[PDB]
Amino acid sequence: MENFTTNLNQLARVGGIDPLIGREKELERAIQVLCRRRKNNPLLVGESGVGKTAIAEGLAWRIVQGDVPEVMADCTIYSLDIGSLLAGTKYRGDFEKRFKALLKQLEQDTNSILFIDEIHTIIGAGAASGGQVDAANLIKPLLSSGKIRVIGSTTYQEFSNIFEKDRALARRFQKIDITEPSIEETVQIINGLKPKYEAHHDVRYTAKAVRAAVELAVKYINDRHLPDKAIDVIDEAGARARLMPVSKRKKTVNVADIESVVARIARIPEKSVSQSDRDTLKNLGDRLKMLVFGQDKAIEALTEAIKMARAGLGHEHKPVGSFLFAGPTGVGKTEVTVQLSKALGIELLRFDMSEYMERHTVSRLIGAPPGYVGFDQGGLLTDAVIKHPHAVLLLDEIEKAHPDVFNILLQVMDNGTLTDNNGRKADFRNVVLVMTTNAGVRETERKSIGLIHQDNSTDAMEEIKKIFTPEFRNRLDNIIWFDHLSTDVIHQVVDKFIVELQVQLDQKGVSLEVSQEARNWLAEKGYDRAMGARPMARVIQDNLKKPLANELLFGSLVDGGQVTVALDKEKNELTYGF
């Protein structure tokens, strides 16, 4: 074992092992497990950046320091990796002999403990040099009899793939749950390692830089457990400090240098790491009021709710917001969402719920079960958010979605996340969730009976309460009701449609002047509150696009030029030559 197993206690004596910071209960469990007769081989099971190996080394350090009771103090912890014994590529003549030499020496020294990092290498695996399945089988009897003790190292997902599949370990080993350290501990961990970064990069880190690397990494980097996200910031700040300033050569890394690299590591703007866009948010309501007319309270409800989320009044785990838009048709409930994403400068992820009416929607939104085509997709919903965690997400006409989609949505509204079928998760915290419904368009066309008409409208949102259950409705920030639009709105709608018509005409080299009276008339001609703004697109198409198309194709407008439309005293559209 002389050139095969690393003595961790010796590295701790040498100084190869950095003192463990915190983790007193994790170490206590490892020793509590090691001191037992059965299930007496601990497994440090976690995720990346938790330090599970650092803890195992940390235990060897405590064994050496004598911070544990003699049962374990002065025992020897050695570590086996995939570098020394896996060199037996000439097979068993090298491998079996070196492998068994360890077992025999370790069997003789019953106060010897091995640490096996990346333990999945052997458990649930066992190849390498073609020696590890039985090498594991040759360790197991000695762990059972108490001749050799073993500390493992794995992750929660690997654990279920390797431990839960082998009863030899179920009776020999015990899981210890390893999670991330505190913020303070992370800073202390950085300070322990800091000099290594300083030495590599020829930089020096301030006290504020190390505190900030941990704090800033938490605020924006969602990739790893605290030690790793903070370290990349320190290592990146260090490196940038020695690369960028060729003409300046600053060595000291301060909070400002952390802010620059965190922004880059975290995939956010160099400004936004500290300074958010206060003004795009202040101006949101007006930019939208200029595009979707008449829905002023709806825009304000949306605008204010977003600002509250952006102002930090809400929960750090939840979506930016969640709204179910409802109202009559042709009122802008989707148009405002589309314009919302543009106004905010945020990519729009759009899912049309009509495409998900079956109970197999999940197989496409989340992903197919393993063994089926499509298991490779992480889910259309989940993948879109993972690649675009900062997004406006639209679920168009949600009342048509199959009810199973609500289990997906209820989870996101409660926890801000959604896992895929491969164990990865979407982060919806920077996603604005808007879903629209036409349950609210149900109304009648029939009037009251009598000489005098009276308003016989039904109660708003009763139809929503009958479609969406309280579980789904109580998780919304709001339900934003859109009203039928008025004739004043129509005049504004006609103006934007005339402009759109002109944009199309500009591409033909044609300038169109529509008189005010022509607009006033069309606005009146096409109005129907029941169908919202739809009809206006239609009346404009019927009265202006028809004549223009005929001229653009066969007549005077074919070459580009100036066309105008006047309203007749007789309410006809009068057109110009060119």
Ligand X SMILES: Nc1ncnc2c1ncn2[C@@H]1O[C@H](COP(=O)(O)OP(=O)(O)O)[C@@H](O)[C@H]1O
Ligand Y SMILES: Nc1ncnc2c1ncn2[C@@H]1O[C@H](COP(=O)(O)OP(=O)(O)OP(=O)(O)O)[C@@H](O)[C@H]1O
Residues belonging to the binding site are 46-53, 327-334
Per rule CB under 6 A, is residue 46 in the interface with ligand X?
A: yes
Which one of ligand Y, ligand X, its own copies, none interacts with residue 239, CB within 5 to 8 A by kind? Answer: its own copies
**Beta-bridge partners for 432:** 321, 392
Cβ neighbours, 10 Å, residue 124: 20
CB of 492 to ligand Y, least distance (A): 7
Site for ligand Y in 256-295 (CB under 6 A): 292-295
Q: Is 60 in the site for ligand X (CB under 6 A)?
A: no
Q: How far is CA 465 from CA 406, 408, 434, 456, 468, in A?
A: 15, 20, 18, 20, 6
Closest CA to 329 of 533, 28, 474: 533
Q: Which helix (H) or strand (E) holds 300?
A: helix 296-310
Amino acid, single-letter form, for residue 221: I
Compute the distance between CA of residue 565 and CA of residue 572 in angstroms, rounded to an integer: 10
The gap between the terminal CA atoms of the chain, to the nearest Å, is 97
β-bridge partners, 512:
563
Q: What is the CA radius of gyration of the chain?
A: 34
CA 262 – CA 256 distance, rounded (Å):
10
Using CB under 8 A as the binding rule, the residues of this chain from 44 to 103 that contact its own copies are 48, 69, 71-72, 83, 86-88, 90, 92, 96
439: contact with ligand X by CB under 6 A: no
CA distance 225 to 517: 66
Q: Which residues within the stretch 132-161 sit at the binding site for its own copies (CB under 8 A)?
A: 133-134, 137-138, 140-141
Q: Which residues 6+ apart lie within 8 Å of 258 measured at CB?
A: 209, 212, 213, 216, 233, 234, 237
Does residue number 49 form part of the binding site for ligand X (CB under 6 A)? yes
The type of residue at 516 is Q
Give which of 157, 160, 149, 536 is closest to 332, Cα–Cα.
Answer: 536
Taking alpha carbons only, the member of 395, 386, 391, 387 closest to residue 427 is 386
Detail the DSSP E strand segments found in 27-84: 41-46, 76-80
23 touching ligand X, by CB under 6 A: yes
- What is the pattern of x (binds ligand X, CB under 6 A) and - over residues 218-247? ---------xx--x----------------
Tokens of 22: 């915190």
Count CB neighbours of 292 within 10 A.
27
Binding mask 400-439 for ligand Y (x = CB under 6 A): --------------------------------------x-
Does 106 participate in binding ligand X (rule CB under 6 A)? Answer: no
Min CB(189)–ligand X separation in Å: 4
Q: Is 249 in the site for its own copies (CB under 8 A)?
A: no
Site residue total, ligand X (CB under 6 A): 30
Q: Is 333 in the site for ligand X (CB under 6 A)?
A: yes
Cβ 307 to ligand Y shortest distance, Å: 22
Positions in the binding site for ligand X (CB under 6 A): 18, 20-23, 46, 48-54, 58, 181, 189, 192-193, 227-228, 231, 292-293, 329-335
Positions in the binding site for its own copies (CB under 8 A): 31-32, 35-40, 48, 69, 71-72, 83, 86-88, 90, 92, 96, 118, 121, 126-128, 130, 133-134, 137-138, 140-141, 167, 170, 196-197, 200-201, 231-232, 235-236, 238-240, 242-245, 264, 352, 354-355, 469-471
Positions in the binding site for ligand Y (CB under 6 A): 292-295, 329-335, 438, 441, 485, 493, 532-534, 537
